[model samples]
Each structure stands twice: as C-alpha cells, then as structure tokens.
Target: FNCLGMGNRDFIEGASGATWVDLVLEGDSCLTIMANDKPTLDVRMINIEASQLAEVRSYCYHASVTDISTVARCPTTGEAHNEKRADSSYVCKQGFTDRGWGNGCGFFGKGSIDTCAKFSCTSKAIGRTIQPENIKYKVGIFVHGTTTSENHGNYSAQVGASQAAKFTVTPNAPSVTLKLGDYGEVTLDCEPRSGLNTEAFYVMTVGSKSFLVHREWFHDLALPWTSPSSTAWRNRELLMEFEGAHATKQSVVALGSQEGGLHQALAGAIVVEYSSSVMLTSGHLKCRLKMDKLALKGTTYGMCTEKFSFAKNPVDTGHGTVVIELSYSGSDGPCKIPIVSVASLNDMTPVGRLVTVNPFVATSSANSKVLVEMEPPFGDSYIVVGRGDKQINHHWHKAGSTLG
Candidate 1:
C-alpha cells in the first residue's frame, strides 16, 4: 500500500482491508494482488480502434465488489439495438410497428431516420417499394377474310393498288355461279364446335402474318350430350393483332367501311404460299367480308393468294373452305356448273395460272379429293375452274400480266 500498487497517490498507506476494489487494466500492465483471500473480478472492456485510445483515460478508477445482483430486464421497454436474439424475443417502443420480439430493437415511424434499424428492417415494415416499370412483350394478333367469284372479276384487283381498298359484295338471288361481289349479305357460317373441323377458313398474306376466324359454336360426336348436328355451330367474331417483321405477297389492308351486307363470319385457317415478298406496316385489321348468299347446294368455298420468288417456283396458298348456297347467279354463262364441294378431308393444291386444259383432274369423290371438270369451249388457254373443294393459289407472272 505504501509503495508498489497504491492507486490513490495522495492516500498511499491510508487504505485498509487489503485494497478490496475492482481494478481495471489499461496500459498493458498486469498487476497481481497479494491477499489472504481470493478476489472476485468482473471485467468489461471497450472494443475500440487502436486510434481511439487517446480520448480515454489510461486507468480511470476501481470499485468494491458488491453482493447485490444486477437485473437486466430489457428495460420495461427497449434498450440497445439487438440484431438477432437467441430466444427470438423482441420489443419496440410506442408508435413503432412490432417487428416480432428478439432480432430488432426499436424504430422511428416512417421516412428516413438515419438509423441502423431502418436499413436492416424487412420490406413489410417499411411498406412496399415498387420497381421501375419496364417493357417486356411488344406484339399482337389479327383476323381478316375475303371473297372471289367469276362475277367479282378480281374485286381485290379493281379496288386499285392502294394499301387500302374495298372488295365489292352483292345481295342474294338464284344462279349457281358465284358472281362478282354477290352474296355480300350472307355471313360466313362456321361449325361452332371445337377440334379442327375441315369446314373452317384460315388465311394469311405474303409473309407468315396470318389470322384464324373461329365461329362461336362447334360440333362434337364424342361428347356425352350431342349437338343439333354432330357438328357444333360457332358464332363468335374473331381477328389477330401483331407486331414486328411482317411480310406478304399482297399489299393487303382490311376494309372497314362498306355496307351491312358485307359482314362475313370468320370460318377457319387456310394455308397460302408466299405470292411475293408482301410487307406490312402497323395497323388494325378486321376479318369481316361480304359473301355470296345464294350458292351451289352442298358446295364449300375457300380463297387465298400465292407468291413467287426468284429463289424457287411459285408457292400455292393454303387450303380453306366455305359454304355455297344457291343464291348468286352467272351472267350469260352456264348455271349449275360443276363447283368445288366437300368430298373427303384431303389437302388439295390450288390452280395458280390460266390453263389450256383443266388443271384439277377428277379424283375419287370419297370426300378426300377436290374434283374438277371443265364445262365446254375448249381453247388454247381457259380459266382454271375449281369444281370441288379448292385451296388458294398464290401465283407470280411477268410484271402485271396474268394471261399467258
């Protein structure tokens, strides 16, 4: 007490009872106390950086060991911030959301408080943060249709060469021949039931840009309950929307203006080969078209175009079908002539160009082939007539000439 470990310099030997006090070690020196009884020690040290020691005292003071126990009951409220608790118990101050019990300490309501608890809190505690909006998909689908008969005389052609043109349509009467624009009043009837029925009409342009028109009804024999016919009727209107590289053989534009009689139903899909490199810009399309009301009984109709490129032979359009009733008539030509009818569900090739003889030969009428027979006036070159079910023929010739 008088020389070696005398803490209070002025007091020196004045201390008694073997200096029973807490000793805090600071400047890296070890001090061993020699006493008759063992000493009780409790230590707490600051884990500061090596540079921060200058601000603190080298050896502040010491205290006696007390018999009273120190109870740390989590402060009736909250204390220091606790990252994760072993028992998973946590508490928060008033006005703050309860983030369970252990892991978190306390939080200030809303906004930035410049605190650690705010940065480590879960998303639910801070409300939801919306991400910036970004564009993902950018494309669409479309639907469209048309009609072509002898009387129509290339209604798609007479409309001029603008991207937009209207195809002519006529009303109903009686003549087996499909006249130019006749039957505009007749709606394209689709067998409404599902499954690829051979009766639907599908069409597309120069590029792969295509559309499928479905009726509102359909026919199914496999169902426990049967429809009026084995075939169901579909009456829904349809169309396709699209974006990106679109091409086609015809500069096709869907005609929106016309008359009420011009409205036709979307039947199904037909395959038409690329007639030429038809391209498309951005626009909306409608599948509605005028059709001949009265046509040959038991006859089905389909229409499509073709394309010819320098790379290969001209390609034919896809096969499509339509319903022909006895309403439209031929001018001075033969009425009740042989037309395309449903024999069998076989894919048929379309007649591309004018021929000296019939392009389509008579095939088996078992409903698998499209049958054709010319009706007189044999010449060097005659129009190729579609007798049975016919597909679209996309053709190419020298410049603007089809007659060869």
Candidate 2:
C-alpha cells in the first residue's frame, strides 16, 4: 500500500484479518492500522523525507501494491494542501540535473521517476555532483606518388617540433611535401633497394611556422660509372647507401615543426634515378687517419695526417706521439696529392684555405695521404680532403694531443 501526504494523520484498513507487509508513504504525522479481524502485518514510514516520495512510488510499483493514498490537507495548519506543489514533496538538495534535483524525485514530475521539475520552477541554491566525459585525438603518416612506376616505400612519420622521419627510398611524386599542424614527431623505414629507378622530391608545410634545410654534407657523382664527369648527377638513390641517410639530421630532415616567421632558404630539391647496370659501390671511403698524442717540442703544433697503412698494420704507439695507419683500394693510377682544408660544420667557414700536402708516395691509392696542423681556440672542425674537384671526404678532428 502506498500513502502520500503532508502534516497530520493517516490510516491503513484491512478486512477479515488481512495482512499487509509493505506500507510505503508520506505525511506530516501519524499512521494507524485497523482490521475487522486482528490484521497480522507490519507498518512503517518508508519515505519520511518530503523529497523521497518518488522512490516510495517506485517501490510500490515493483511490489505490485496499487492502493495509494495521500492527505487532502495539512494537518498542523489545517490548510488545503496542494499535492502538486514543490513544497509538498521531500527536498533532496544534493545532486541536480538538467531539470533540477537529479537522484531525488517530486510530484507532477516529467520524464523518469527520479527527476525533478523543470529548471524554471526549480531552486538554484543546490550544488550538483557532476562527472566529465573523456576525449582523444588521432594522428598518423601518409604517402603518395607522381607515377605508378615511381616507387613508394613504407614510411613512418610522426609530429614534433624538432624530430625527424626516416624514408626507405626517396619520396617521389608531383611534389613530396610534409604537412603538420603543431609540434610532433614521426619515423619511417623501408627496403633500401625498393625504389631503384625513380626520382623523388620532398617539401614541407608547417602551420604558422617556417623552416630551412641546411646541407650538412653530400656526395654527388655523374652516371655511367666508367669515367668521372663534371656534370652534376641529381639522383636520390645514390644517397641511400651512406651514413648520413639514416644518421641523426643527416640525409632526411626530422619530421617535426618549428615556430618562426617564414624563411627564404629551404631544403634543396633531391632527385633520384633507377639504373640497373650501374654497379654502385659504397660512395663513401673510410680512411685511417690520426694525429700525434703529444704536442711537439716547444710549439703547440701536432703532426696530424693520414698514413698509408692497412688493416694488418700493428697497433703500436711511436715515441712521443700516436701513429695511426690504414690502407685503401680502388686506385686506378698513381696517387695524387690531396688538398686538405678545415671548415666549421655549423657555419661552413674555412678555418684555413686549402693546404696542398704532397705525401710520401708509396704503393697507396691515388690521393690517399693527407695532413694538416692548426693552432688553439678552435671550435668544432671538419677535415675535408679532396682530390682536385672530383670527390671529397669529411672527418671530424681535434686540435689538441688527443685522437678524435
């Protein structure tokens, strides 16, 4: 049985000693149970608060108890009670919803059994227990090409401010460009031989930011592989088999974004070709070069140079200095004197003009031996040894008594 009301007294009636287990309700006051025969049962105030009547109603519905009653008047003031009034219901004052009271209920309610009246008729003095929702974002890499013959390797790209992406082969297409919204990073890797006969170019588009491509170092050679030509060969595949290709900030620029005004200088265009007959040996040569470990006599100068030594040379320390020697192959003729020059890797400033060094000629490859010496107060330096204007090699060296 469900009873709802305000103030005063209410009664529960049973006939022929009938028994009622659940008596749920509302009131300002009292309850009395009566029966023609002694009614075997229980009576209790299920909803004492004026705000909990909606829950009491739900309990009655679930129990299949349809006998519902409410007080027609306020017992204390003897005023005509308005059952639909907000004050007639219990006040939960805690949680709120779009309509007002959230977990609580009221008479003359709208949608669910636990919702209150519309916000227009509800009180705003109560605070609500609200929970926020969760959200996320999606980011990834993409690739496209100019022609069907142009090989596109598997690429992994990320978003970043100062990060780099890896490429298996040169990115080809109408215009290979990287676009990023903000600071993020990505990486890409692919089979080196995948794009053998294709040309690719790359460009970058950054949001509200600009960047420049500085060539740290590069090696270019003409085609046909028989005789060296002076014509510049802009092939991207030639760049694949070198250290700078995957080395940090070497061949490919980091897939990252930077914030600044637009700059006039950008990464130079790279071109690649696919040639099957061209037997491309590693375009790079590793030479055994060293410097004396100790400063010479009274001077700050140290004897630093390349020696005609081989892999079988003994690792020995000569008196007062470190002697390093290594041999190289691929010499087609008599050795030529190598022109050694020192330059700043950062600014490309020549610390000194080309120093022509005539080495002690032996059965060594052409332009294999080189040597140089410099004073103190030097910054990061690169020793660039070149055979005329044909090809050049780069090495990092120090000015003191230690080997770098």
How many pairs collide in each candidate, listed in order?
79, 27
TM-score of each: 0.15, 0.16
How well is each residue in 1-404 modelled by candidate 2, as lDDT tens digits? 11112234345444443332122222122233333322111122221100111100000000011112122211122333223335322211111112223423233222211211111111111101101111010112221101011111112221121111211112221111232222121122222223221112111222322111111210121111111232211221221211221101111111111112122233332211112111221111111111111111111222223333232221112111111222333353234324333565344445543211122123334433222221212444454443433434344443445675
Best by TM-score: 2
Model 1 CA RMSD to the hidden true structure, in angstroms? 44.7
lDDT of 1 by residue, 286-314 (tens): 11211223221212322211111111222
lDDT of each: 0.19, 0.22
Write down the TM-score for model 2: 0.16
Candidate 2 — what's its lDDT? 0.22
Query: Which segments of model 1 are wrong by more than 4 Å?
Result: 1-186, 191-404
